[PDB]
Amino acid sequence: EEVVVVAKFDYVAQQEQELDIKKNERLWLLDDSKSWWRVRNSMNKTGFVPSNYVERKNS
Amino acid sequence: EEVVVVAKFDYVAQQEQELDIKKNERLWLLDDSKSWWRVRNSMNKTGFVPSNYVERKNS
């Protein structure tokens, strides 16, 4: 459910909602069942949603 | 690449960084190649990082 993850690479956060990490840092993964996509709505609000809640429009 | 996605299901945001969405709403997916995990560091700062930059310490 919550588990510890290890950074494989550095990451410089590009927004306030992101986290800067360093290679080999250990971090809590809050929910190991959740992968998130960053989306933007018709009102120009941006945020994260669980990736399985959306799908590409091709029909 | 940016693409249009469609909500499969409603989602009520649990945190300010997430977005509320309604089934059938159309959204911009800012980067179709990018999935994120929410993590918490040793200083108890939380944020999103690309999922492929981190791996489980155990299994």
Numbering used by the authors:
A (entry chain A), B (entry chain B): 4 to 62
Excerpt from the paper describing this PDB structure:
Nck proteins are composed of three N-terminal SH3 domains and a single C-terminal SH2 domain (reviewed in Ref. 3). Nck recruitment is required for complete T cell activation, and its inhibition dampens TCR signaling by reducing Zap70 phosphorylation. The objective of the present study was to initiate development of an inhibitor of the Nck/TCR interaction, specifically by blocking binding of the first SH3 domain in Nck (Nck1-SH3.1) to the PRS in the CD3ϵ subunit of the TCR. During our studies, it became clear that Nck-SH3.1 exhibits conformational diversity and can swap half the number of its residues to form a dimer.
During the crystallization efforts that led to the monomeric apo- and peptide-bound Nck1-SH3.1 crystal structures, seven more structures were determined that all exhibited domain swaps, leading to dimers. The swaps are located at the exact same position in all structures (i.e. Lys-36 in the n-Src loop), clearly visible based on the high-resolution electron density. Dimers are formed by exchange of the C-terminal 25 residues, almost half of the entire SH3 domain. The interface thus generated contains a short anti-parallel β-sheet encompassing the CD3ϵ sequence 36KSWW39. Superposition of the Nck1-SH3.1 structure with the bound CD3ϵ peptide shows that domain swap and tight peptide binding are mutually exclusive. The C-terminal half of the SH3.1-binding sequence would get into steric conflict with the second SH3.1 domain in the dimer. All of the dimers are swapped in the same manner, but with different juxtapositions of the second SH3.1 domain with respect to the first. The hinge at Lys-36 provides quite a bit of flexibility that allows the dimer to pack in many different crystal lattices. Indeed, the hinge region varies over ∼6 Å within the superposed ensemble, and the distal loop covers a distance of ∼8 Å in the dimers. Given the large number of swapped, independent chains present in different crystal forms and grown under different conditions, swapping seems an intrinsic property of this SH3 domain.
